[PDB]
Structures are given as structure tokens and as C-alpha cells.
From Swiss-Prot:
Protein name: Nuclease A
Region Disordered, residue ranges: 116-136
Gene: nuc
Subcellular location: Secreted
Amino acids binding Ca(2+): D16, D35, T36
Full-sequence portion shown in this chain: 88 to 223 of 231
Residues at the catalytic site: R30, E38, R82
């Protein structure tokens, strides 16, 4: 059973990355199970839908009154020291909102952290079906 913990927005970095104050310390969080187009792609510049996926995440966390983080059952940090979690803004999962809007693809790359994989897969199909953004 997963559980949500409070956090405070510090700043939105990218479509898939946000800096939050968590248990009194600043931490960078990488959104579990999604891959958004990058704006800070180490190699490829600004990918198509990057600006849009970034604006989307930023808007959602910046306008929330409450942000919560939910770790999965596997490892909690990646090799870069980023927290791996599902982020909620006023009870809405950011992870799902992105996929539903066709601003992210379902990744899945830490076999243990899969609690919401199916849920996300269904939203991605719907976004595909509606040919939105990425799927357009």
C-alpha cells in the first residue's frame, strides 16, 4: 500500500522533473513511469512538445494548493540522486495528466516501481486514440 506525503514546490525544471522541499530538504524528483520530450536534452536540443510538456507540468504544480509525493515499492532514488515518485497536485496525479494529454509516453524502466503502470497505459491509449500532441 502506497501513501502520499506532503511536499512544497521549489521549482519546475522540465516536463518530467521538479524540485521540491521534502522532509525539510530540497530534492529533485523524476516523475515515475513517464517520458516527456526534453527541453534540456543532453544531445538533441529542444524536442517537439518539450516546451508544451514543460509548461504543462509547471502550470499544474505552480497553481496547486497542495502537492503530495508517493514513492513506489522499489528503489526510491535513481543513480543521479533524484527521487522516483508519482506527484499529485490537488489530488490529481501529474504523471497521469501528462500521458492523458499526449504530452508523455509510458516509460517503465525500474521493474519494481510499477504500481500504476496499467492505469497509465490506459490513459496513453486514450491519448493515442484521440491523436493528441505527441500522437498527432
Amino acid at each position: 500500500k502506497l501513501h502520499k506525503e506532503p511536499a512544497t514546490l521549489i521549482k519546475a525544471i522540465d516536463g518530467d522533473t521538479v524540485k521540491l522541499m521534502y522532509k525539510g530538504q530540497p530534492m529533485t524528483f523524476r516523475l515515475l513511469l513517464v517520458d516527456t520530450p526534453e527541453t534540456k536534452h543532453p544531445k538533441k536540443g529542444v524536442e517537439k512538445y518539450g516546451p508544451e510538456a514543460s509548461a504543462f507540468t509547471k502550470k499544474m504544480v505552480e497553481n496547486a494548493k497542495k502537492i503530495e509525493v508517493e514513492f513506489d515499492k522499489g528503489q526510491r532514488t535513481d543513480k543521479y540522486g533524484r527521487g522516483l515518485a508519482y506527484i499529485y497536485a490537488d489530488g490529481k496525479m501529474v504523471n497521469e495528466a501528462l500521458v492523458r494529454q499526449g504530452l508523455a509516453k509510458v516509460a517503465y524502466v525500474y521493474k519494481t516501481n510499477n504500481t500504476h503502470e496499467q492505469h497509465l497505459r490506459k490513459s496513453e491509449a486514450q491519448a493515442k486514440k484521440e491523436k493528441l500532441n505527441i500522437w498527432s
